[PDB]
Design an enzyme around this catalytic site. Sequence first.
Site, PDB file in Angstrom:
ATOM      1  N   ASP A  45      -1.063   3.612   3.184  1.00  0.00           N
ATOM      2  CA  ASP A  45      -1.369   2.374   2.468  1.00  0.00           C
ATOM      3  C   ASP A  45      -0.447   1.282   3.008  1.00  0.00           C
ATOM      4  O   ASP A  45       0.739   1.218   2.680  1.00  0.00           O
ATOM      5  CB  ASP A  45      -1.184   2.519   0.953  1.00  0.00           C
ATOM      6  N   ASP A 192     -10.483   7.393  -2.604  1.00  0.00           N
ATOM      7  CA  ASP A 192      -9.050   7.092  -2.629  1.00  0.00           C
ATOM      8  C   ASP A 192      -8.652   6.483  -3.993  1.00  0.00           C
ATOM      9  O   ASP A 192      -9.461   5.878  -4.668  1.00  0.00           O
ATOM     10  CB  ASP A 192      -8.777   6.148  -1.474  1.00  0.00           C
TER      11      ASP A 192
HETATM   12 NI    NI Z   1      -5.270   4.202   0.397  1.00  0.00          NI
END
Ligand code: NI
Lengths: 235, 236
Positions: A45, A192
Amino acid sequence: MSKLSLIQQLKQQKLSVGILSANWLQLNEEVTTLLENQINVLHFDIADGQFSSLFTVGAIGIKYFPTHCFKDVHLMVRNQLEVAKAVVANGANLVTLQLEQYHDFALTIEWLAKQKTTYANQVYPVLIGACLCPETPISELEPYLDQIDVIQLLTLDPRNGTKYPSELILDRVIQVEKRLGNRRVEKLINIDGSMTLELAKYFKQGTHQIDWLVSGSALFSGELKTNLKVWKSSI
Amino acid sequence: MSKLSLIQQLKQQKLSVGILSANWLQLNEEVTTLLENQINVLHFDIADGQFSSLFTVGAIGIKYFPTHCFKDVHLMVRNQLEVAKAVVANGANLVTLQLEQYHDFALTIEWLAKQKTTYANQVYPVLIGACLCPETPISELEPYLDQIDVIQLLTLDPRNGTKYPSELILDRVIQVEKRLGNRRVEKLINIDGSMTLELAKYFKQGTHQIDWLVSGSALFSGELKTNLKVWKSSIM
Ligand code: NI
Ligand SMILES: [Ca+2]
Ligand SMILES: [Ca+2]
Ligand code: NI
């Protein structure tokens, strides 16, 4: 090697592990444990505190992980083109943009489409992803469906922290699958967002093909080895 | 210990180590080596791709380093107040702001001034830093000299591709010194940005006291153990 060949190979893997959810002083051992368990897909991320409050890591975060790992690089940023260049330069194998970030979406997928990197011991085009927050209509994918390789569905909206119903997310998987038709085999449909064993089980009980689930803090809450035994037993 | 006594103790160290310049799969070995070498000041560049194109790591970057290390946290961000809160929550011991972030600088030092943290096994106020890019006038520091503990001078501007002569950075140390007067003893004057042995020798080539040099990629170009041997023999 073609995108399609790569995509079919990747479907052997079931979990994209959010490796920076581990203790950063134990990264080598955590990655070793993953490899020992036939897992080599690592999720990152990359978030600048501009798309959401989420301010995590930049390109440097992915840099030191071995090239024999597939780097699934999820951008939640303002400057998608710039950041895409930086992560591709650090070895990203998949670069996923946020569909909601429309100001440079098309431009960025255009640049990505021409990039290649090395995975394992071969040269592939970089895979391109589109991520949608829960309220973003699947209908907004239409102009890009042909061009993208990965459709990633978030379980939560990082822009408010709100976690959305798992049934909605499964419905969205169905809506995506419908639109892909006979080209479903050419894409990954991944989920996700704050993944838990309970969500994992619900999504996989769902009789519709999800390629990867992305792991988060839950995998590293307790020993990785312990949690992997459960993943491998339960899902 | 008060803030002033901490500052004196901090002056016993000469190097603030940019730890994330290391190979990330080796972070624990690298921290162990520094501690073995009587070095426990760790520098973090918290940059969001907004103040400049530099986009490194957020507050999570400092979280897993031991609380017995002094965390010297350098912000190069748009929303300083918000990031300052996040880094303090993750154990920042020093929070250095960019003076060029005019909109929330004063507000953020106001917030910082109320904060306390743990170093060793003692509670201290969080130290406050102000960092200037090379072209920022030293005079712009004047209103804040009593409110800050650390003045950090960059050798480069991440918003630029300009190559700034090192001589200008030493000139800037003098400009800071002159303004501080007898207050100098109360502060750290530190230099950051693409540090090399050559540059270190130059800055340390005396007359004008510099407290910490911040290390970067050079320290981890070749073995850490080797480069520390080199640093200690040259400067220390
Ligand atoms: Ni992600
Ligand atoms: Ca853990
Ligand atoms: Ca090295
Ligand atoms: Ni710095």
